[PDB]
């Protein structure tokens, strides 16, 4: 299943957030309407916050992360959650080596914002 | 129902950051083996992060975190999602005010680290 | 914060499912557009299905589910989570007296269907 | 990722429904500790309920739902999430074909049961 996809009510400010987990150095792609809009990198096994930023979901509202490591993308794992009807989060999980702990590098973005 | 409590592997490290968005200082305080293990303080409407941490979650696992406004207790939403049996996120929003956006502190708990 | 309240897209089939795990009876009702849409009712310790139905989210998709005993409410716990995207789980759970499970009766709407 | 895999408290009964959305009929297996405690098979494009039972989890709580359609294993999406600390899903969708929804086969777990 396509995975880091997600539909965002349009022309609305989320916030994106990178979290590094690995012995590697992780770079975060966002990409709003199919164009990067945000790069993160950085190299942590402590959960360093590698980048974080806001966003506009633009006219699409369509979102999607990718992770690489050194150019090979990472395999990724990703849901959406909804509480009280009103608060979302989009998260993001993503596996660079042969642990499976897919926290390698983790992004979650959250709206609404302000 | 209690919300903001969550149950980790016992004597697990995990990653606590939290994110404003609100006129009004949020006071985010994280509670494990039942005293405040870190406390967040900070405004902002822009969603920054106004702390991060790593913390150990004690002999019972039990974490949780607590929001206040100038010594008004917020009213708190959460959930746990766990992607592909591994990776975890315990998820706060939290109302200062009326306008329940729920997103006045938001706080992400993530695990494992490493 | 407000609990077993969705908005579903507009003009869209969802199935809801309704389980019981309670000495005490059950009556579960589904609203659209605040209007009863399916009722249904039971007693089990043992996760009997007391209801399924398909239902259409309307045009104004406000989706809400409702749990009493012995037309005393019951407070809920509920979320969204979302699946690659597409598939859509709005989950309820409800308490009807004090050991705090929130299993009394559970409620799980999906869509879309078909 | 593998996906439909989740580790339940040992020792611990849930309940598994199964529900169908294609003109494919669709078989769903419930493994515990990698041995098929139940299987469903049926036919609906309604969301008709193919399956219910109520299982034991083990001695290991290794749980998996496999969908299968004419033979050929089913790409699953899949997550848990748990509410207030204790209510408990495991979510499972299944594609047999392009289309994209995941949802010719949907699986519910749930716990604590009672
Ligand atoms: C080389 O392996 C990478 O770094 C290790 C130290 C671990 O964080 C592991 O999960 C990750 O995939
Ligand atoms: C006064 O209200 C508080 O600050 C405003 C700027 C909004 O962020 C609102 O959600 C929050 O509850
Ligand atoms: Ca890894
Ligand atoms: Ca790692
Ligand atoms: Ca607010
Ligand atoms: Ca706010």
Redesign the interface.
């Known amino acids: 299943?396509?995975?880091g996809?997600?539909?965002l009510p349009a022309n609305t400010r989320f916030?994106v957030?990178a979290?590094a987990?690995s012995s590697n150095t992780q770079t975060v792609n966002v990409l709003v309407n199919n164009e990067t809009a945000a790069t993160f990198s950085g190299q942590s096994?402590?959960?360093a916050?590698i980048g974080?930023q806001?966003l506009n979901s633009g006219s699409s509202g369509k979102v999607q992360v990718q992770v690489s490591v050194n150019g090979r993308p990472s395999?990724?794992?990703?849901?959406?959650?909804?509480?009280?009807?009103?608060?979302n989060?989009a998260?993001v999980?993503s596996?660079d080596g042969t642990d499976?702990?897919?926290?390698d590098a983790?992004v979650?973005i959250?709206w609404?914002?302000?």
């Open positions: 299943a396509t995975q996809v997600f539909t916030g957030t979290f987990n096994t402590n959960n916050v974080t806001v395999d990724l794992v990703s849901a959406q959650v909804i509480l009280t009807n009103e608060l989060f998260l999980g596996e499976n702990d897919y926290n983790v979650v959250n609404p914002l302000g």
